[PDB]
Ligand binder design. Sequence first.
Ligand SMILES: Cc1cc2c(cc1C)[n+](S(=O)(=O)[O-])c1c(=O)[nH]c(=O)nc-1n2C[C@H](O)[C@H](O)[C@H](O)COP(=O)(O)O
Ligand SMILES: Cc1cc2c(cc1C)[n+](S(=O)(=O)[O-])c1c(=O)[nH]c(=O)nc-1n2C[C@H](O)[C@H](O)[C@H](O)COP(=O)(O)O
Ligand SMILES: Cc1cc2c(cc1C)[n+](S(=O)(=O)[O-])c1c(=O)[nH]c(=O)nc-1n2C[C@H](O)[C@H](O)[C@H](O)COP(=O)(O)O
Ligand SMILES: Cc1cc2c(cc1C)[n+](S(=O)(=O)[O-])c1c(=O)[nH]c(=O)nc-1n2C[C@H](O)[C@H](O)[C@H](O)COP(=O)(O)O
Lengths: 386, 391, 386, 391
Amino acid sequence: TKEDIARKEQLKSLLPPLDNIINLYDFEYLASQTLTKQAWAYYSSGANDEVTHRENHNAYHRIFFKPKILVDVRKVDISTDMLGSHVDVPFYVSATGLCKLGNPLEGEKDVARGCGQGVTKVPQMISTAASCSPEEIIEAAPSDKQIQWYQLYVNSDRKITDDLVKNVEKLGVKALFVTVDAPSLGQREKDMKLKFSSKFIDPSLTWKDIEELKKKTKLPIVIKGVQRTEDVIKAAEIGVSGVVLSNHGGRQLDFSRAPIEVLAETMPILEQRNLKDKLEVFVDGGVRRGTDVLKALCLGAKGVGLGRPFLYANSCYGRNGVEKAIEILRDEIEMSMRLLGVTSIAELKPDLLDLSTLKARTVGVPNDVLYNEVYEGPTLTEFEDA
Amino acid sequence: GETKEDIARKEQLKSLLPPLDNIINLYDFEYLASQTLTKQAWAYYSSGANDEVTHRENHNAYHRIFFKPKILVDVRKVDISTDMLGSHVDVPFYVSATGLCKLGNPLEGEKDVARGCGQGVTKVPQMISTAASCSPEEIIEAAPSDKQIQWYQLYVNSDRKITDDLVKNVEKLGVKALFVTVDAPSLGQREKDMKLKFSNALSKFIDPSLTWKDIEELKKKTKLPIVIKGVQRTEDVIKAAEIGVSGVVLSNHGGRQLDFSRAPIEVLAETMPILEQRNLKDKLEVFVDGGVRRGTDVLKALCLGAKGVGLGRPFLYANSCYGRNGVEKAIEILRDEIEMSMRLLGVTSIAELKPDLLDLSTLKARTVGVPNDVLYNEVYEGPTLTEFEDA
Amino acid sequence: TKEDIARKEQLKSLLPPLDNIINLYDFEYLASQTLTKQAWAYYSSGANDEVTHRENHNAYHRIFFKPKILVDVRKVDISTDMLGSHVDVPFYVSATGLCKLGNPLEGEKDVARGCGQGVTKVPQMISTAASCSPEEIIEAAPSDKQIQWYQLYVNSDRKITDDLVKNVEKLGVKALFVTVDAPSLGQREKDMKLKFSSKFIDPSLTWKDIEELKKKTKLPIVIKGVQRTEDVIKAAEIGVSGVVLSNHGGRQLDFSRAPIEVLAETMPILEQRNLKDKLEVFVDGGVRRGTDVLKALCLGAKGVGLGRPFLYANSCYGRNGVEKAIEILRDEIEMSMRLLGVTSIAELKPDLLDLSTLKARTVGVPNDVLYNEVYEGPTLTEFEDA
Amino acid sequence: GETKEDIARKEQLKSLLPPLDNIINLYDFEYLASQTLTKQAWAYYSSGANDEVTHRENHNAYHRIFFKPKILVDVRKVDISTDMLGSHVDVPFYVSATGLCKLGNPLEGEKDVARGCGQGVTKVPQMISTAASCSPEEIIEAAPSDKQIQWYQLYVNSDRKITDDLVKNVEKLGVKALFVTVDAPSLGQREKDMKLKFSNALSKFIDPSLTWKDIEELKKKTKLPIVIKGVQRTEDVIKAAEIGVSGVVLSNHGGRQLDFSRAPIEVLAETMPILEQRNLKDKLEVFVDGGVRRGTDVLKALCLGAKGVGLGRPFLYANSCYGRNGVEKAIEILRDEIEMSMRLLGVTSIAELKPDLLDLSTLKARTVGVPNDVLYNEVYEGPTLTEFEDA
Ligand SMILES: Cc1cc2c(cc1C)[n+](S(=O)(=O)[O-])c1c(=O)[nH]c(=O)nc-1n2C[C@H](O)[C@H](O)[C@H](O)COP(=O)(O)O
Ligand SMILES: Cc1cc2c(cc1C)[n+](S(=O)(=O)[O-])c1c(=O)[nH]c(=O)nc-1n2C[C@H](O)[C@H](O)[C@H](O)COP(=O)(O)O
Ligand SMILES: Cc1cc2c(cc1C)[n+](S(=O)(=O)[O-])c1c(=O)[nH]c(=O)nc-1n2C[C@H](O)[C@H](O)[C@H](O)COP(=O)(O)O
Ligand SMILES: Cc1cc2c(cc1C)[n+](S(=O)(=O)[O-])c1c(=O)[nH]c(=O)nc-1n2C[C@H](O)[C@H](O)[C@H](O)COP(=O)(O)O
């Protein structure tokens, strides 16, 4: 609408220096003002009323910390293992389709770059729906040490999916995340409203098919989009490597629970049956601060994913932005680890958390409109007129 | 009390209404109606009893329920048809009785909802109000389809002969059930309505004497299935089963009667397990209404074991902005919302919607916060986001 | 501040016709705009941060109704007995000092008039701190049938209080409410802020003194301002007639509980010890609708008081306003009784109430300012530009 | 990053500040400071770690506690004096350590709080910060009264000789206890502060290695009572008692360090009963700080068994607007708030403040609402009040 005049003025040199970016929300704010209406709609959107998208995040605040004091914390290590690889941090960039809307010149290529160009090396989940080719993305990663996973929507045409699995294996991805929370497309209304002037994805995907995909590949399988303890147990029973507790960033079923709350529930069940070492359990949704990450890890998550935050960093400052987002988050984790009073990821245990109010998921009774309207609050002292 | 704001409202209405294809959800209809209906029409449709808490609560209580969706289930094909009161129904929801539909649709009123409910590929049951602005005969005649279900809403008169003639007439006109409304012996005080009359409660028409005996007698006078509409507690659900009526609507009249009646979704959750405990499982069909605006709302109620879920206001609004095709669009929006969240839920039929698909652990978290600390919050300044360069 | 120009313009003929007053809040609104800054401050005020004042009301919303349908409700009776007198309604006007601030010409006289001038006769509690004399108030009541109670602050000079008790007995008051929640004055900051350009009340009042006051008078004693089950039991043990569960309209101790919540707690204790008939138990605070009254009565209150609502009616439309406030409330009760499915005050029992969430008295965790600020809600469909 | 808004702030400050007698509560000081301090001073004082939730929570958690006041008790005379760490104290509260008090009071800084704490009829303990802008000697010299209590806040340096000299110096200067701060091995990220630096974390100074052994050693090196400041869980309270230190401050540094540390009032409630269960009753004096702004806040903490309650920010604000007499006014406001609500509580001394005066049943109701339904709430129109006549 010939208004992106204003839009290139902000982008251009009105953007703050990267070094002035304090947190992940800063990236989000700037993204909100500079992207095209449709890039913004496509990235920021959730399903229907977007309660789950929001509740993904808010549920972290239903958990508090019980930190240890008087512990030597001079030295902290936040490295860990995810899917047989050693990783610098306990988080990753979750898979995120069509990055070219926000970063038109480089797209998914810049995520790879930002994930390996600096001191800390963060795993990248690549979308089957990436606007770049899997080859353009792997051959762009500036360090052999960095790792890459492939996210898979299994096609109705299973020949397509059988060759895809084979092409990514030989390109060096270290795992397959099979997305199972999107048999039909979540109704994302922000998109639709602006639009006013599936085959891609097989809705028949079965457990039996996952049993089958186990046999046709040597890459480790994580079932991405589990939303129930019962199905975590089912992933164990069929012997996949892992599972992402996820609701697609609240882009699919609205009133899916927060994965953090589901985590809290499933981990203890997985212990009453030996299964803690069997199944790596990942978590995404709503994660915006180092303490969110820490809460997850304390509950038993092997790793925690982020989508939108990185997507927004990438869309404003490309690869450099991604590297900074990594820096911001990695420091948030170390700094708060220290205040928690532990020194390694393996020391992050449930006794560090206060879980007594996890289930305080409330809906107030409607506000008394008349009563509140006529009431006049207390008032501060004023300053003389002089 | 309308100005020549009849004009501001008319240009609004007049071609400024967006194309029907651009309506995404049931709220849109609501929004459009709020700007285009006459002040009296808007007040009559949109209002509730006293402080309107029950009205809003009806809706919010749905949000105290979350889902436990099944993954990696074959959800290629999905069917949302079911049965209600002995008839096959394309859909698990229906249009509840609303009086005076001509305030919003002056030309056609209830006839246009009959048309919307029955014209297209998806057909929806319609409950006809005793306070309908059109006649029963007009509304039944108007029905474009033989396979479409019309039900009749009854207010029993103090003069029982009138009620007797009425029941005989609608049975003969071919309605398929009687919903006897029991939650309005006294008329709920809808203050938005009163606020117009100035600056702009017992009646013989609805008999405040209606009793359990009266319902018992009524069922010997007709072969139509009888439903008690306006049940607000489990004790009365059990009572309904005892007198052997067909069903019950857990309802509070859309928050238009008693304020601080519970959300029907909450009563449902309490009631159905107690109806297993006592065997009465499928002796009584249990319907729920009020505050339903999304397919996931409908799904939650069915998972608790509602036979069907009714909507009032959303259909009023569609009819008032877009007549018959508005009603069909409303039917399509909701139909699609239900099918699509069934797939994501991991079930393929109505019978497969069961309590184990719901997380019910925070159902009871209906809270009133301690008043906030206005001075503390006033002086407090929150974090801010980075700004763009000054220039 | 020569602004009460505006003030007499509203008062004068800008005031809506009495017949256009729908509810008790309407009176409150109009009062808010027309009273002097200091009358408003003096009436509307609560203690410190005014949480209790507000929580008095909000706690009613922590209770829902379980109403009976298919009950013949053609006929309802809301009459009852309070302190050996038959009363038309199950409520009363609580005592309220200095009514001349709002109604300068008539004051406490107009409350009496409004309480007996129309069809329904409501009891009046008279303040020891009334701006009118007890004689001017009793001799103004236009029906002998109407009843009057006296509220007593016992003076440090007990001669003053001994003659006062004697003067009100012979003037025909049918009871004494001894106020015990105000040994020191609650800090009411709205007053203080505007003011910037005790002996009256004995802080040594003891149980022993109430035992003593029992002997020196034949009028029935209600201890007004009980805030604990433990002290209700103490009023029983010393054989007073009644007790008002009250915190002075949140004008005294902030973070006193809502009397409704205290009611809910004490009534069942009074049954596990025979005491339900022994002690009449009254309740005030926050009551603004017929359903508030009904909730109280269902829990076992013998009556429910209101202050501010009547005070505001009286201050805008004097005696006529008071009569209308009575009408508004009395109809609210009958109408909702009917919808509840009972026909007499004695049928108002706890089984009519849903008490499962009485203790859902919550404080949210602080709002996530950044997260919420950047989030953009869903949006309604717009209307064409045309 | 100050404009010649140094001027807008100076006319504000300059005689436009209201008379001290017109200040009603601790919030007023806060308000006045927010308009008169330099941007850096305001950010440094008012800010917390990351999203600042713990900071606000410190305060709100007090509101999860209600009172069970005793009636018809003789409350003519009331006494709020008590003892802390072996000294008699006029009051149950104290001024916690805040660094850099010269940002707000350029001329006098910490010396003016020393004066405010000790000048008048009511005297209040002062904890001196290691990051004080004035010197210990300056601040102690400044104390107008022999009977006034000064305590010292210690950050142990990586170079322990510096800490050793410091402890010997302040002991000799006559401070009455050591508060060793343990909740800041890493510096909390206070983003309001950072937001100025642009567009306008380990240090050798605070040793991140500090250990339980180090505290044990410290107590053999001084006769002063030692308090561990920044205890955030009961497990560490038990640990403090085991090594036989004098006391513990349940504190999270005013929400300036770990975000999502609990409200200390909540930890208090959990901790004290466990300190009966194990006998350790009065082996350890337990202090609480953070979010305290009213006398009833102080009362709640004492009823749970705190020995004393500390305040940071409110005293900073009084000192920054009004220097020494601001501090005294703050002391008087709070002193009066405590005495007056003791009477209404129905007790007459500190020892009489016990758990049975509190309603603790909703202490755990720390909730996060499900996000609200923006579309539902948007279209919804509430009831309105009557209007005055058009004319
Ligand atoms: C933001 C976003 C997220 C997407 C995403 C696209 C966007 C714009 N997409 S999508 O086009 O199908 O909807 C996917 C995707 O391709 N496949 C997938 O498994 N997850 C996808 N995710 C979800 C992602 O994997 C995380 O679950 C999600 O972003 C986590 O939520 P936050 O963004 O709140 O961290
Ligand atoms: C919105 C509305 C609802 C009415 C309604 C009128 C309006 C404007 N009316 S009424 O004039 O008596 O109040 C009736 C009616 O005629 N008879 C009846 O049984 N239900 C009536 N209902 C209630 C209706 O049957 C549903 O219970 C109600 O609309 C469901 O709530 P929602 O609108 O929130 O879905
Ligand atoms: C509104 C108000 C109430 C007063 C009241 C004065 C005002 C302006 N006064 S007072 O000057 O001491 O504070 C008294 C009073 O005289 N004595 C008393 O027992 N109650 C007094 N009450 C409290 C009254 O008895 C009720 O408890 C209170 O008004 C009930 O709260 P609502 O106003 O919210 O119903
Ligand atoms: C407000 C504030 C508090 C500081 C404070 C500085 C400020 C501006 N500082 S600080 O520079 O390291 O962060 C200290 C300090 O020097 N040393 C210490 O032990 N506590 C320090 N505190 C914390 C103080 O001792 C109390 O725990 C805190 O102020 C209590 O919280 P309220 O302000 O909410 O009462």
